[PDB]
DNA sequence: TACACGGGACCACA
DNA sequence: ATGTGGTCCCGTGT
């Protein structure tokens, strides 16, 4: 149990699947930031787009 | 087995029960899953109902493509 | 303990 | 044939 999370779709996997063309890139960024879990990356890539998360 | 692709590299998968695709990183292959923690998952499932896209790698480009100025520095 | 991460296998699909 | 998204079970580690 608990690894789904509550969206506005209903309950989805906190496990995911990059395409390779995004993991590829994705990696990248992980690794450049020389985070060691890739969840860390995917909270500054938030983070590094708020902005344009605000519109819409 | 190693194969060319846009922006990088692929490496084919070996065994039979499973066909899955890795990419090559700089830390070597990589399976293509990963795991968000509970409160990265919800803010980023989040965006990814805010763009209405169905699938969440579409969410992560687009937030590729929206932090680029960030990532290249 | 409780939760977390990720490898392996897997189903439905194209 | 061989890829695909996505999920289940479990070994292991925080």
Do not use: M, N
Request: overall charge positive; cysteine-free.
């Amino acid at each position: 149990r608990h690894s789904k999370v509550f969206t506005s779709k209903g309950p989805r996997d906190r496990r995911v699947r990059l395409s390779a063309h995004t993991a590829i890139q994705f990696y990248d960024v992980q690794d450049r930031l020389g985070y060691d879990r890739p969840s860390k990356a995917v909270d500054w890539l938030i983070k590094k787009a708020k902005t344009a998360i605000d519109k819409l | 087995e190693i194969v060319e692709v846009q922006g990088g590299h692929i490496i084919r998968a070996t065994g039979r029960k499973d066909r899955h695709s890795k990419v090559f990183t700089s830390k070597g292959p990589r399976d293509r899953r990963v795991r968000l923690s509970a409160h990265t998952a919800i803010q980023f499932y989040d965006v990814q109902d805010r763009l209405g896209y169905d699938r969440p790698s579409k969410a992560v480009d687009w937030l590729i493509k929206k932090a680029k100025t960030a990532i290249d520095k």
